[PDB]
Design a protein around this ligand. Sequence first.
Ligand SMILES: CC(C)=CCC/C(C)=C/CC/C(C)=C/[C@@H]1[C@@H](COP(=O)(O)OP(=O)(O)O)[C@]1(C)CC/C=C(\C)CCC=C(C)C
Ligand SMILES: [Mg+2]
Length: 335
Amino acid sequence: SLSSSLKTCYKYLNQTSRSFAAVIQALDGEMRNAVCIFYLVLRALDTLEDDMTISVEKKVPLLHNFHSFLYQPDWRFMESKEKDRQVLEDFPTISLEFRNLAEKYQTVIADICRRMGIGMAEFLDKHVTSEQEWDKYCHYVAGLVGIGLSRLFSASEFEDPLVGEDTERANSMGLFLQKTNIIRDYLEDQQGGREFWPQEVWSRYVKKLGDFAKPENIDLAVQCLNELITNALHHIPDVITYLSRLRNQSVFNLCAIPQVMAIATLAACYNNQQVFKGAVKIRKGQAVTLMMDATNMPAVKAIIYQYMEEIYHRIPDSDPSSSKTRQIISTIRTQ
Ligand SMILES: CC(C)=CCC/C(C)=C/CC/C(C)=C/[C@@H]1[C@@H](COP(=O)(O)OP(=O)(O)O)[C@]1(C)CC/C=C(\C)CCC=C(C)C
Ligand SMILES: [Mg+2]
């Protein structure tokens, strides 16, 4: 029943997505293929953005015109050294199945691809300075994914136009997972020469971001860690609002599960010295387990509050963000 090229696409999905493979495949009807392809295209775009062997000069055009390659049946890329390179090397298969989608899905995917590429290109020439610039970077690489996902949910008509139209809530959905991964991946990123923590934040603690890796700076490092976590917690009211509107079970599970996995990650990272020594880059099993039964808003809220409580009771009174952290948590609780 499934074509060869589509089986391959779902193959690539399972190979490359630790976080989304199962939920994508459980999607109802015409959403499944559309979101699968959306994933694969963005994975290909990211595989380009992240490859450091590709010079800025060559990368810029690639990121700018990546959206147009979807409509070039022959287009592939063979120069990648990245682990996920096969999506670029077999891009024609992916772009084939992309062109097999209804126009309404293609237009969304292409638009998000164009916008993301322009954004990723813009950050090749700069660091993340301010918190606003942090939000801007996250918007380009993650915010727009939630915005695109939401426009696909609306286009399909399983969800109301509001889901696709409330771009702020969809953006926050994207921002929360991306801040979470950035916070969690400090060391891995430092060791690979990538820096994502906003300078205006860490510069109040140390002179170079890599200094958080020095044992003598652990206490300052954890302070900065708690400040950034606290900034990310601010997206949770919006996540609640967004998850509260979803009508379709499959869509609700797709959106809810990664948000809750991220919340468990943050709680595991709060005031945790070990962030600076490596990574819990494996889903929290307590969270996976709780989410098996959490198919509705009141169950998801209960899990959120529980994790928020876990952070709340561990806040040091001496930590300089201690007030803000308690404050956002209290807001979440009453949303
Ligand atoms: C289309 C689809 C699901 C995904 C496409 C994702 C791709 C490839 C984007 C290209 C840039 C990248 C890479 C961004 C980072 C993803 C890493 O997750 P992760 O856990 O590391 O995966 P795994 O661990 O399995 O390797 C990220 C954090 C953004 C996820 C933002 C979402 C999902 C919007 C939520 C909003 C609503 C639900 C409104
Ligand atoms: Mg990237």
